[model samples]
Target: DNLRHFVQDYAVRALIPYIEHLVAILAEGVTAELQTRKLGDLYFMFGHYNLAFQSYHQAKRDFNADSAWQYYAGALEMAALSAFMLGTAQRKTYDYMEDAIVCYLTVCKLQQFATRATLLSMECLKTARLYSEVAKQLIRMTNEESDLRSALLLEQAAYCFLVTQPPMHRKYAFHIVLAGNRYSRAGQRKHAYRCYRQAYQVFQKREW
Candidate 1:
């Protein structure tokens, strides 16, 4: 809670606008690729999904092969999430999710570290055989935990299933609950509660 407390104590609305302006300035700079990725992340956190997607895609296109693949995956992930927010379902969301999955898989295959068991493992994950295990662990850990990390992962997973051509929900409740918990931890009380209520309402039959 210390981080949360500190964030709240120091956080101010003015800072948001200032940071946004700074990001805009950076986006206009020559080193726009990296800046765009950072700006896209900020936009995503602030719920500006469409803009975030654009920035992410731009970054992906601007980066080198490996880096580009990673950036592309990230952009697709954000795009899928943004589409979900916009109420886009399997129609377009699936395409984005598939695109993201392909990118992530490519990154993972090229180097095992891309799909490690632990979140940070991906950074050091390597080898073809380990890729399968990493992918499994990624799904497992993402689904079971209610921590902030898990919430983010669920958002990613749900976006995947909802958008994927053939959906997967082996751990729906786990993912949803994890998401709600994460929102609450971040002080997004209403949004957290809403995610919970909405999940239960829509997937009641799933016992989630």
Candidate 2:
């Protein structure tokens, strides 16, 4: 409760001293992960990205040691967020955009938020728009066996396929069309047509 009250105040000076004392005690005890996480938060609140990353890195290690997946996931998210902040602030050595995405992917696998993870990953991929990465993420969704998710993922994958040119695009279109045929034969013609039409639009747009 005292910690909660202290947090609500936003007095960094007061919090610093308290955090130092807390860190010392936790380091000597078994609450190593908690200690590191608290330190990370403190450093983050103070805009010390490097220190924050270091503390979160230690928290990740301690959480992984105990297989505390929830804590581990939280640490990953924070680590990724801190890296993004550092990058945005022109901290060249700490710019880890790819690492951040990897961390988010791990969080998606660890938590019950695959869809959320997919969306965020897509956001990151927008800068480069690599079709292969998009395809891999969509393929991952297919494992869940949702008719809706499957249809959407297939259509999206087809769209991603269209991002390429020539032979590769043709190859992807055929691959998606064949998958649509299977969907149609399986009594999901509505989904199949939707998939087919979307894929076909790519070539249509190119006047092919």
Candidate 3:
């Protein structure tokens, strides 16, 4: 409770007035986008997630309006979480998260940031029991380069396939093959050979 009060005072005292100072700077637009994001964070830190959603909704528009790709992506990520967190009309969560990662990875050319949001979205979907969606997303986010990252993604995707009710055996095998290739490229020969050996067994037993 004391810690919460400490944070509350900081938000009520220090941040709000500085935010007022920032409104003048927002005339040019970028500052407006950032300060607006801070407001969303302020509410989120206070555990008032509905209020956070409102601020994130506001920032999403502001950032997109100004062509601030990174901030726009951030707002979408947080806003996606807000909807999922609220569990109110939640179907829109994936759409926002997909748009966010697409913008960050494909449009904005920010692969590093793209990776972060993709993982975050997957975690969100994982909590929602959308394992198939997480696997699909993990596959989509994998690129030719960054072997370690690719291997990690593919490995996780295989797990996603395995966790499903029917246990998508084919998907697990294919993604394991993909992950093994990247693992070899990333210099983990032991891991690579392990997956390759397993794939050989799965393929050998198949009639088709």
Candidate 4:
């Protein structure tokens, strides 16, 4: 009975101030580099690459060499993604994209067995290979197998594959359709149209 009373008597009023302080700290803490990386991820996913850039920059500062390089690569990738969003057909977009490719490559070159590094390498490689005029010539001969990380590198690679592959690919076309349907239903017609256009071109290529 005493324990039950104690449990029941726990005061929500007493905890409110602590909860408020925690919320305040979280709001203020986002700019720190480690926190910034998470913010960057949120921005990147939501298509706000500029804020992603700032967060990645903060993360880069807090990271050590081994980790810092990876964070720096993330910043470069977000910058490229932001630029690509703004200038789809521009040469500068390709340049930023290639810069991301270079950083991703460096991670693999430094440690060939690093699965995340390798996955990033594949993504950047496909990006530069398909889009850039001057593909990076850097290569390494290795037989290392993948050890999947907490993050889904292959799903990322698949997204890269979907993006980089010729529009005629059936899978690519299907993904575009799904994306268009989803975005349109969500009331984001502009992005939906872009998806439809891209998918339509792929369908047009093979008349499939």
Best by TM-score: 3
- Give lDDT tens digits, candidate 3, residues 92-112: 757777766675565566777
Worst 10 residues of 1 by lDDT: 122-131
lDDT of 4 by residue, 1-208 (tens): 9987676667666777877785575566554545666666655645666676565556555664544455566665666666656644245544544454454556556444333434444544455545212212221222123222211222232245445453336665554465456555553667567657766766777762
Ranking by lDDT: 3, 2, 1, 4
Predicted structure 4, TM vs. truth = 0.36
Give the runs in model 3 whose Cα sits over 4 Å from its true position: 1-31, 84-89, 165-172
Give the Å error, residue 117, model 2: 2.6
Tens digits of lDDT, candidate 2, 104-131: 5554554245565455555545534355
User: Which candidate leads in lDDT?
Assistant: 3
RMSD per prediction, one decimal?
A: 13.4, 9.0, 6.8, 13.1
Question: Each model's C-alpha lDDT?
Answer: 0.56, 0.58, 0.71, 0.50
Question: What clash count does candidate 3 reach?
Answer: 0
* Preferred candidate (TM-score higher): 1 or 4: 1
Per-candidate TM-score against the hidden true structure: 0.38, 0.53, 0.72, 0.36
Model 1, CA-based lDDT? 0.56
lDDT (tens digit, per residue) of candidate 1 on 37-135: 777766665677767657656755676444546666666566755765675533454445445554555445533323332343322223111233333
Clashing pairs in 3: none
With a 3 Å backbone cut-off (N, CA, C), the pairs that clash in candidate 4 are 167-202
